[PDB]
Amino acid sequence: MQYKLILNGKTLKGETTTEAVDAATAEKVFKQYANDNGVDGEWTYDDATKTFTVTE
Amino acid sequence: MQYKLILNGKTLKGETTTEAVDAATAEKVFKQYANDNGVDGEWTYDDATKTFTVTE
Amino acid sequence: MQYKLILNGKTLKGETTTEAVDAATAEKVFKQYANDNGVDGEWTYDDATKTFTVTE
Amino acid sequence: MQYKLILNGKTLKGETTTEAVDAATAEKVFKQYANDNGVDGEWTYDDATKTFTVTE
Amino acid sequence: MQYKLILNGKTLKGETTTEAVDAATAEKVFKQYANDNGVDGEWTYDDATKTFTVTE
């Protein structure tokens, strides 16, 4: 399945996605990716819509 | 300054960079370049680290 | 990035803009918008200044 | 150390400064700041006097 | 099929191509070739158009 990460940071904003079997494994990319992207804030995950969002 | 665009598309993946005064002028190259590259998706812009990323 | 459409028709004159990754996707709004606006003429697009113009 | 940016634009003129370790990091503020200020032109950087100047 | 590598380095610029069944096998030549050419940077691989590009 695929999950979608929304970029909501100081200036980082747009969308992000990944293909994974598990939600927690998908976050590994997005959370680690957030460091490479700069926006690191409070995280959340909706398993009902496979959608993640990070807000700082 | 320099901004970095990450390639995250169907199969287009690697890194990209450009030297510009403005972030919006830097995107003109990357967003226009994306058409020439094939990967056209949602966009975010890190002004916090000068990093862009496109996801389709 | 942003493109600018100039209105040059029979009586419809002004400026128009849109935020898009591609120039061609930006035209979809402007060209389709022109029908809703009434001014439909010869089109052109400058990718060097992200500027469109329709003349009838 | 500190770098100094000179404002030489259409109507925006004055002086600017910032405290940074690197020259390229100092420009991030000045070049990004220029968008917020309106004056965006050709850039230059003297590392011998830590002085930047933007001319449009 | 054939893939195309674009040269975008410090001073090395041009086009490159190779005939291969797989993309990863095609890169072996281009990546290894880049060492012989001097331009070694970040890499992307467009499989969507069969086009590679290296930026340093």
From Swiss-Prot, chains A, B, C, D, E:
The species this protein was found in: Streptococcus sp. group G
Swiss-Prot/TrEMBL sequence repeat ranges: 3-56
Compartment annotation: Secreted, Cell wall
The gene designation is spg
Q: What is this protein called?
A: Immunoglobulin G-binding protein G
